[PDB]
Amino acid sequence: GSYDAYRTDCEELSGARTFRLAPAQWSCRETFQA
């Protein structure tokens, strides 16, 4: 994972989302705009 430490968030948002959908929906979408 961990594409220059940017998508290291976004791999939860790809899978772990089912048990997150807000506490982690706070980085991939805006730290680099997906």
Swiss-Prot record:
Organism listed in the record: Homo sapiens (Human)
Subunit note: Forms homodimers or heterodimers with ARFIP1. Interacts with RAC1. Specifically binds to GTP-bound ARF1 and ARF6, but binds to RAC1.GTP and RAC1.GDP with similar affinities. Interacts with ARL1. Interacts (via N-terminus) with IKBKB and IKBKG; these interactions inhibit activation of NF-kappa-B.
Superkingdom: Eukaryota
Name used for this protein in its record: Arfaptin-2
Subcellular location: Golgi apparatus; Golgi apparatus, trans-Golgi network membrane
From-to range in the entire protein, with total length: 235 to 267 of 341
Role summary: Plays a role in constitutive metalloproteinase (MMP) secretion from the trans Golgi network. May have important functions during vesicle biogenesis at certain cargo subdomains, which could be predominantly utilized by secreted MMPs, such as MMP7 and MMP2. Also involved in autophagy by regulating the starvation-dependent trafficking of ATG9A vesicles which deliver the phosphatidylinositol 4-kinase beta (PI4KB) to the autophagosome initiation site. Involved in phagophore growth during mitophagy by regulating ATG9A trafficking to mitochondria.
